[PDB]
Design a binder for this molecule. Structure first.
Ligand SMILES: Cc1cc2nc3c(=O)[nH]c(=O)nc-3n(C[C@H](O)[C@H](O)[C@H](O)COP(=O)(O)O)c2cc1C
Ligand code: SF4
Ligand code: FES
Lengths: 85, 430, 213
């Protein structure tokens, strides 16, 4: 989860096409590889608003806390028994 | 008492150890079993657990945990689920053949131990997990359990005390890992005998997820004698915190390999030279002795001269007491081949669940197989030491510890033999 | 020696297996030993019962055990491959199991293995061409003071020499059945030079019993 720690700013993907000579992926998009790293959401919003870029924000998706118990694998009457181990 | 050993027949718990008398109910009642059992059952759980705690009984399975303190983990009010005493009769340890003798020759003592120990912990029934190779012993115990049901000693209204207690026998199917308590619980539940992590302890979540105590045949079978004869009687033998009598299996390179009952803190030299007829070729022919079955590190002849055969004297002797299965090895023994065959046992008997034992016990078998021939260099001795220390204390159960400890004992006492093996390999194969 | 299966014409899911009706009553008695809701606890005894009826386990005994216990078939395959008694190949009529761990190896079980091999003409793992004997090499059988020793299908033949085990193989080829014990003079596990203990008459009931009990 080390790659899920920071905020990012990428742009919309533009056209890529086959180079006639070599079959390479040509582009006319200068901002195609531009990826910026931000610590918070507000810093990325401020850098988008500062440069006149139109943005959308997706909120951070944190994994919810799970209830883990090794002894639930061997319950007397519940369905959460394991059939093997 | 400063000198131990020399145990008389009036103090032997396991009379009819040798099959010399009738193992059935008319024989067992005439030797002292099933006497005043209703009076033991009617004095409650706390009296019986106090008599086991006062007797200083420790677990005979190899761990040596205090048995009364272990069994009082079940002394708690019910929460709907039943409670189960489970008798560990697997006995897959190399050197160990004593619970076979208890089940084959004193079966009603095991049944009465199941009844008394199950009343002490409030258990509904007793599942005895016997070894599947012990088929004649299993049918032997089954005839005894039918005799104890038909006499009203177990079952509905057990011994006339108003207690309902069944006794079951579950046969294993050939895995040494099913002697470990949680893997035995998994094997009763109909799965692979793979050990559980702790917590939960079996007293919380055991067989079928009920409260459960797993105990050895021997520590269950001595419990009616500890109730009848008293705890202070059984605690009058051996050193303090090493109380009682013990079945000792002497095998290997002795003249008369035998199962024998003996006092706890007996000398090992006195035990071998009294009950086994000495080492083959005299005591000067002694090379090493694995004191307690295969999971304990060997100790050489210089250590075995004055060592006492209880838990504390062997832990201070940088080994263990274990199942007290004395494998005796003479000076005509390739000791590296014997420890390599023992590590070969531990990789053919390992359930493969967690990474350190599954990978490292096979890798120790490969390094020991190169050490037997000598196809190695002396940096690999310390390499094998560090591999055994990476296995120890990192596995789920103690088969990793029990497979690392023979390697450690062999290195620690016989590094020069490994070194001269490898250097003569180098000077004759290059 | 493999732990995957391939359907052969003598081992496939259409190999005929079914329990005898008296074995169905035995399976009823087995399943009644375990709590209700935990019928899967009878996987080991019913699979051993199927091996005792059939001699070995095809993959229809495993499917029948999975069918009459309402468990997944993979959960029976796990048990059948985990435990080393379940013969997933057809073994001979007398399955000889020589112990070669250290308490039997120190008392020269290799000479017994060599004697069984040169008597039967086979090696470790092979079956005789008339399907009477399968010689495999096993781990500690739990009869260590009676070392060296073999097991032949249920029975422990103990304190063996090469002559003793050759006599056993002779009378197993002769259709008889031998006596399962130590082949030396002693009876079960005592010291061979007489009893070093338990010679006195045992006391009987009431001896050493504490007061108030
Ligand atoms: C690999 C392994 C094998 C074991 N085998 C046995 C056994 O065969 N018999 C036994 O009583 N205990 C065996 N034990 C010890 C048990 O885990 C447990 O300590 C014992 O069965 C019950 O405790 P007790 O000593 O108080 O009776 C084994 C432990 C391990 C790690
Ligand atoms: S230590 Fe070995 S035998 Fe035990 S759970 Fe781990 S792999 Fe299995
Ligand atoms: S060593 Fe062969 S039976 Fe235990």
């Amino acid at each position: 989860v080390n790659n899920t720690k920071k905020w990012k700013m990428e742009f919309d993907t533009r056209e890529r096409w086959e180079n006639p000579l070599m079959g390479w992926a040509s582009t006319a998009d200068p901002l195609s590889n531009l990826v910026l790293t931000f610590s918070t959401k507000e810093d990325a919003i401020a850098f988008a608003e500062k440069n006149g870029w139109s943005y959308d924000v997706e909120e951070r998706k944190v994994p919810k806390p799970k209830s883990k118990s090794y002894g639930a694998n061997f319950s007397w009457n519940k369905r959460t028994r394991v059939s093997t181990k | 008492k400063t000198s131990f050993g020399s145990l008389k027949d009036e103090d032997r718990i396991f009379t009819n150890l040798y099959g010399r008398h009738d193992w059935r109910l008319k024989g067992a009642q005439s030797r002292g079993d099933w006497y005043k059992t209703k009076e033991i059952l009617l004095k409650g759980p706390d009296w019986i657990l106090g008599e086991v705690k006062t007797s200083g009984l420790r677990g005979r399975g190899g761990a040596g945990f205090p048995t009364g303190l272990k069994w009082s983990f079940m002394n708690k009010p019910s929460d709907g689920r039943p409670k189960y005493l489970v008798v560990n009769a697997d006995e897959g340890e190399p050197g160990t053949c004593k619970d076979r003798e208890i089940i084959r020759h004193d079966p009603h003592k095991l049944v009465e131990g199941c009844l008394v120990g199950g009343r002490a912990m409030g258990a509904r029934a007793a599942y005895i997990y016997i070894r599947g190779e012990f088929y004649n012993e299993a049918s032997n115990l089954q005839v005894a359990i039918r005799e104890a049901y038909e006499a009203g000693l177990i079952g509905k209204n057990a011994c006339g005390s108003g207690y309902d207690f069944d006794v079951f026998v579950v046969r294993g199917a050939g895995a040494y890992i099913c002697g470990e308590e949680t893997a035995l619980i998994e094997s009763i539940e109909g799965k692979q005998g793979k050990p559980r992590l702790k917590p939960p302890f079996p007293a919380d979540v055991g067989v079928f997820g009920c409260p459960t105590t797993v105990a050895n045949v021997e520590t269950v079978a001595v419990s009616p004698t500890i109730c009848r004869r008293g705890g202070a009687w059984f605690a009058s033998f051996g050193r303090e915190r090493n109380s009682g009598t013990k079945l000792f299996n002497i095998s290997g390179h002795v003249n008369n390999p035998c199962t024998v009952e003996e006092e706890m803190s007996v000398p090992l030299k006195e035990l071998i030279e009294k009950h086994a007829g000495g080492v083959t070729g005299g005591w000067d022919n002694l090379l090493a002795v694995i004191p307690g079955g295969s999971s304990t590190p060997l100790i050489p002849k210089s250590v075995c001269e004055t060592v006492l055969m209880d838990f504390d004297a062997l832990i201070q002797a940088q080994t263990g007491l274990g199942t007290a299965a004395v494998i005796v090895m003479d000076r005509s023994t390739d000791i590296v081949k014997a420890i390599a065959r023992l590590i070969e046992f531990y990789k053919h008997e390992s359930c493969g669940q967690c990474t350190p034992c599954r990978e490292g016990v096979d890798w120790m078998n490969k390094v020991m197989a190169r050490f037997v021939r000598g196809d190695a260099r002396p940096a690999e001795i310390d390499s094998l030491w560090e591999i055994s220390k990476q296995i120890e204390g990192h596995t789920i159960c103690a088969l990793g510890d029990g497979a690392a400890w023979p390697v450690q004992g062999l290195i620690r006492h016989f590094r020069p033999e490994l070194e001269e093996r490898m250097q003569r390999f180098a000077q004759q194969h290059q | 020696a493999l732990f995957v299966h391939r359907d052969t014409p003598k081992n496939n899911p259409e190999t005929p297996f079914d329990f005898t009706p008296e074995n169905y009553k035995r399976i009823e008695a087995i399943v009644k030993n375990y709590p209700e809701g935990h019928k899967a606890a009878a996987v080991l005894p019913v699979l051993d019962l199927a091996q005792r009826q059939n001699g070995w386990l095809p993959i229809s005994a495993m499917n029948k055990v999975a069918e009459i216990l309402q468990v997944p078939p993979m959960r029976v395959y796990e048990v059948a491959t985990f435990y080393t008694m379940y013969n997933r190949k057809p073994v001979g009529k007398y399955h000889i199991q020589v112990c070669t761990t250290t308490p039997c190896m120190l008392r020269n079980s290799d000479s017994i293995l060599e004697a069984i091999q040169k008597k039967l003409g086979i090696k470790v793992g092979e079956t005789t061409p008339d399907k009477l004997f399968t010689l495999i090499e096993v781990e500690c059988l739990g009869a260590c003071v009676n070392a060296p020793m073999v097991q032949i299908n249920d029975n422990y033949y103990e304190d063996l020499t090469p002559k003793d085990i050759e006599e056993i193989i002779d009378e197993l080829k002769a259709g008889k059945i031998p006596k399962p014990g130590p082949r030396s003079g002693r009876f079960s596990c005592e010291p061979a030079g007489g009893l070093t203990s338990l010679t006195e008459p045992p006391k009987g009931p009431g001896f050493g019993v504490q007061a108030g009990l």
